UniProtKB/Swiss-Prot annotation, chain A:
Region (Disordered): 27-52, 220-271
Additional observations: This protein can be partially replaced in vivo by its H.marismortui (HmaL2) or human (L8, from the 60S cytoplasmic ribosome) homolog.
Taxonomic placement: Bacteria, Pseudomonadati, Pseudomonadota, Gammaproteobacteria, Enterobacterales
Protein's UniProt keywords contain Ion transport: no
Pfam families reported for this sequence: Ribosomal_L2, Ribosomal_L2_C
GO molecular function: RNA binding; rRNA binding; structural constituent of ribosome; transferase activity; zinc ion binding
Protein name in UniProt: Large ribosomal subunit protein uL2
Gene Ontology BP annotations: cytoplasmic translation; negative regulation of DNA-templated DNA replication initiation; ribosomal large subunit assembly
GO cellular component, one term: cytosol
Similarity annotation: Belongs to the universal ribosomal protein uL2 family.
The protein's role, per its UniProt record: One of the primary rRNA binding proteins. Located near the base of the L1 stalk, it is probably also mobile. Required for association of the 30S and 50S subunits to form the 70S ribosome, for tRNA binding and peptide bond formation. It has been suggested to have peptidyltransferase activity; this is highly controversial. In the E.coli 70S ribosome in the initiation state it has been modeled to make several contacts with the 16S rRNA (forming bridge B7b, PubMed:12809609); these contacts are broken in the model with bound EF-G.
Key words of the record: Acetylation, Ribonucleoprotein, Ribosomal protein, RNA-binding, rRNA-binding
Species per Swiss-Prot/TrEMBL record: Escherichia coli (strain K12)
Keyword rRNA-binding: yes
Gene name of this polypeptide: rplB
UniProtKB/Swiss-Prot annotation, chain B:
Residues forming coiled coils: none
Organism, scientific name: Escherichia coli O45:K1 (strain S88 / ExPEC)
GO cellular component: ribonucleoprotein complex; ribosome
Biological process terms in GO annotation: translation
Listed name of the protein: Large ribosomal subunit protein bL34
Pfam families referenced in this protein's UniProt entry, alphabetically: Ribosomal_L34 (PF00468)
Length: 271, 46
RNA sequence: GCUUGAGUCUCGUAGAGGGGGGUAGAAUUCCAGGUGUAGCGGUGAAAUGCGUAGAGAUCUGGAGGAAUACCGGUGGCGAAG
RNA sequence: AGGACCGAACCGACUAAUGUCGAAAAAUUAGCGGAUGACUUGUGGCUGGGGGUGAAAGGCCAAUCAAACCGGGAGAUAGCU
RNA sequence: GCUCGCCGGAAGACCAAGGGUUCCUGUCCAACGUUAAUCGGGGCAGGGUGAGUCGACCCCUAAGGCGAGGCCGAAAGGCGUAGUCGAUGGGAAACAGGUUAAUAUUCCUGUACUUGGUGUUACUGCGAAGGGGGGACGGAGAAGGCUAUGUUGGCCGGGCGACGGUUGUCCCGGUUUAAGCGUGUAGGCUGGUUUUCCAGGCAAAUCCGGAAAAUCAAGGCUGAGGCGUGAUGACGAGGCACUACGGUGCUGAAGCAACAAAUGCCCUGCUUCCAGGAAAAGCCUCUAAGCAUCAGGUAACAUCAAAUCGUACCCCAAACCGACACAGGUGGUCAGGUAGAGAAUACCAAGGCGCUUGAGAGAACUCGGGUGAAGGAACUAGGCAAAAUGGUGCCGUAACUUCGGGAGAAGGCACGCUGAUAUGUAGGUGAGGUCCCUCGCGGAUGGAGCUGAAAUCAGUCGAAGAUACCAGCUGGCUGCAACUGUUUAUUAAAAACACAGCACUGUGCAAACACGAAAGUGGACGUAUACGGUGUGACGCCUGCCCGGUGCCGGAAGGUUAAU
RNA sequence: AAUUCCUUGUCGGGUAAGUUCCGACCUGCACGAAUGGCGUAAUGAUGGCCAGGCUGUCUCCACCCGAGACUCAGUGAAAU
RNA sequence: CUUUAAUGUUUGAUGUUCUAACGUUGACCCGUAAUCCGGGUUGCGGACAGUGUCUGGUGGGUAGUUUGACUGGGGCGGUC
RNA sequence: CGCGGGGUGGAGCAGCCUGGUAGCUCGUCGGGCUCAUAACCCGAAGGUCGUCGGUUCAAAUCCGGCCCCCGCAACCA
């Protein structure tokens, strides 16, 4: 549920918090956690590779199984947990055999439902099964690319992949970007759409609302001195150079995609 | 003012220690040069 | 109190009444391949635009969005829209 | 609840005065801004010279920075004093 | 030695770091100290640091580092696995009193605790680099229950007092006691117990998890403090006795009550919001390869060991870092009385000092300040500086607004001391007495004593009653910027940067991009409601025309065109 | 106007007197719509202006209290 | 000679498919309690991709550098 | 002060560059269309090429003096 707060102070007046009365207010499941100590954009050489990252809050990583390899056995959703790392939620799911595991939280899924993983699954949102046993024009997510990776595409809040056709051993998908690519049809995809579909409407408000998350103040190039950024210098905000990155390459217009190894599978592209 | 030398032997020996120099090739040149001048205090250590 | 006002119950009838979720075909646009050739489109006429990089025209398949031909009637329905 | 209000510890450093061979190679006195946060500091490692770091000034990188310090090229070179 | 004066959330009392004998005694005065110096952190000789419980080392890890093979790279070397190091982290165990010129939870006395080795006795299945539990956890706020600790009463000892009263509701001093064991309170959490089954825990499992039923309603775990014990002990005001006149020897009464009450403990809690808040081992538990008259394990007991290093002194400074005995900087802890909301401030406590040049003078001028008739910004670049406002409660408070503000707007009022309501109230705390009882640290009832606001009236005094320190100047028009925040350390703190938000665009994961010759990381153990870049910079009403030139994206027939 | 050279532009308000300020006129040397345009409550150790209170800032200084200056004794620099 | 026809032959440019190079930052097992690496199966791509030599283009991302003199001071204009 | 360009029927612009002929649109005059006007249609005319001098077969043109006009520059201490 989305709520807009009231102006009790400068900066608070623009905050909108997505509140979930269903999310478990206790503590996550013990055996499925590990340390995920920050990096801040550093590499092995201790140099900052990616800018605007570091600091912020400390968060514990929840190891969630995207594989869905425990075949057939029915499972019951016990409780939805808040996941700091992902835009979506995580559901504490227990099978019939007595095993607890975390998975993503699809849209129309409440506490106490029944899911399963495999080709024997009925068509119910939340079930994961190979894509050759799914009707065309479906709505899925957590789609893999290799029989065993785990799932790469559509793994954030409110995203849903639309299967277009299932011609032969390949299935034509119409991704979230609009790019259509063929993939090995024996890759498991979880039915329905992913929940937490209000994450998009969240407006931070304060500067700290972005700060305790992990970002750093992004400094504009025109303020810097020409020795630092390809832009910069001048007396009174001067410009004239075509927009580029702090490394010279052109931005605001230049297709950098060049792999060719995966160009084969790609049919259509984002226009 | 806050001076530019707040000593701490734990930190001082980790950097300019005997073994810290003996650890790498560049450092091994130092022990060679220091011994070349005949400097009694080869490094900072008791 | 009564009963001709008004209102309820027992049974049926006709209707684009309203809201939610699915689905079908025609047609248009674009896209891909093939056939195929200098015009096409347009208007009172013309021009911008499209075209020998191969359109329009024609065939096949697909992706998509909206509207629902004939039935349709000074027909029905709604407090009105 | 609050990057909320007043105000000490703590951090910081706007004005004036003293100081300018100073008590001190940016401090003292009197007033000042923040003071539950983008807060503050201890301990401890990581990032390095055309590189590091940077809420961006060409500021910071051991009182030194529009390219640190030390040694070696090197008795550089000088139509200059 | 006697007065005086200063700090007293410090200029005091102790640890860490860092120094490296600066600690103590005797002795000396050339040099050192900004003067003298019989003095000293100076010279000379001697003396001083005592540990199974404190710390380090040790066991176990984070960031991160090194890193057998290995991958990679002209060489050097780079990255990294298994491993192995690395605390500021987790983990076994001591408190009280006394003593030395100097050290003491280390020495003595008294009284306890921990972890292992070995041996006997009685029982019994034990057993991993493997599995589980545990350790194990956020910010903020609130309430209750306590203690540290203080005030006061009672009690004991002493005094009854160099100018007036002072055997009295009088003055002064003391009135302190731990760890451990026993009890397990206030209070916190969780439903316990039994049997069976199980594709789960890379194997097994009686352990854990799950699914069925049976049975009872409590059990279990945790937990400050209090009370006994510790302790007819110690200490102990103050005397009696000897003074090398430094102190020693000896003896030694009272030692309780009550209220107030923390930021300490309960709390590694409870509630709540969200940005969703180390790891591993010690510890406990279950089994495997196996070993089973064994070996080992559990309980009690006898006995032995607990090694090595650190330990003196300074630690808001004449000893650390600043060239100096330097008005600077330096993490953590304890932190009393009165007024006070308070750790601010004023004066004081324990305690520690008067800052290492002094004596006269009272000139101009300078620095730090006091007061100021008349006027009141005429000063001046400018109300810079000073001045003045300044507390609590209550009353009252505009244009405008994003409906929160604006605002503490502005502007006013009442405060002292005594008596009274009431030989001190509301309220709070709360013994004795009584009864009940699944009988104890319990529960209702009870109310003395103790403690203690604010209010109203009356009276009194001075010029002034928030009398001191402390402690807002207010309002209006308007530019820039939304706002908190950051920035040139050492002349610029701003209208500059940042900011949430907006937009275009790049990216389909071996993602774009970046560091890196490479490998390999980061991006991300994220995946288009995601990630990098640029521009602008909350919110509101909007965001008009140009594709010429330049840049970039799309289409490629022709022309031109490299190596070959 | 943080933009106007000529310019102290012109008119009106504010002072007895206003090259600054405020509201406007468009004659914009040379504003302008994300190198954003026009406004905007709160905020500001920000910039400009005016009114009140208040005062030694000033009119015009005077006195007083302390540290130096001065004198004495000891020690004993520096730029040039 | 020009226009053209079947065959052989000579290489070349597209297209589709295959498996054996190669890739595999897919799954499983072992060396081994090791998510690095290697090896073995297999699945998916596939003679592409990627790399090395040569070559054109883009290229201030980076580097070494030039940017005249006379001149009634230098610039500017003028000139040699 | 200096550099570059311009001045052409009533008006605004070509032609100048590379010299011998001055064109386009609007305006003006006349006629026609309608009752009348505009508009439109038809026809004709109009230019010292700013001014003077020079070179020359030939000058709007190339050069120079001057006037007018426009842009630019008029600087650093």
């Amino acid at each position: 549920a989305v709520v807009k707060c009231k102006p009790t102070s400068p900066g608070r007046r623009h905050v909108v918090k997505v509140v979930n009365p269903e999310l478990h207010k206790g503590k996550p499941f013990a055996p499925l956690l590990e340390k995920n100590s920050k990096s801040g954009g550093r590499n092995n050489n201790g140099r900052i590779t990616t800018r605007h990252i570091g600091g912020g809050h400390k968060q514990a990583y929840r190891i969630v199984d995207f594989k869905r390899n425990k075949d057939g056995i029915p499972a019951v959703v016990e409780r939805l947990e808040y996941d700091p790392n992902r835009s979506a939620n995580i559901a504490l799911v227990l099978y019939k055999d007595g095993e607890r595991r975390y998975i993503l939280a699809p849209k129309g899924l409440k506490a106490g439902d029944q899911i399963q993983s495999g080709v024997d699954a009925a068509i119910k949102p939340g079930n994961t099964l190979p894509m050759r046993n799914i009707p065309v024009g479906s709505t899925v997510h957590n789609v893999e690319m290799k029989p065993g990776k785990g799932g790469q595409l559509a793994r954030s809040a409110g995203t849903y992949v639309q299967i277009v056709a299932r011609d032969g051993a390949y299935v034509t998908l119409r991704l979230r970007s609009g790019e259509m690519r063929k993939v090995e049809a024996d890759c498991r995809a979880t039915l329905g759409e992913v929940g937490n579909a209000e994450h998009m409407l969240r407006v931070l408000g304060k500067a700290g609302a972005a700060r305790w998350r992990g970002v750093r103040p992004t400094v504009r190039g025109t303020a810097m001195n020409p020795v630092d950024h390809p832009h910069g210098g001048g007396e009174g905000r001067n410009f004239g150079k075509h927009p580029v990155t702090p490394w010279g390459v052109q931005t605001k217009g230049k297709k950098t995609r060049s792999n060719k190894r995966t160009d084969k599978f790609i049919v259509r592209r984002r226009s | 003012m806050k001076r530019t030398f707040q000593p701490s032997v734990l930190k001082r020996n980790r950097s300019h220690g005997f073994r810290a120099r003996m650890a790498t090739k560049n450092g091994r040149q130092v022990l060679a040069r220091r011994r070349a001048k005949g400097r009694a205090r080869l490094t900072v250590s008791k």
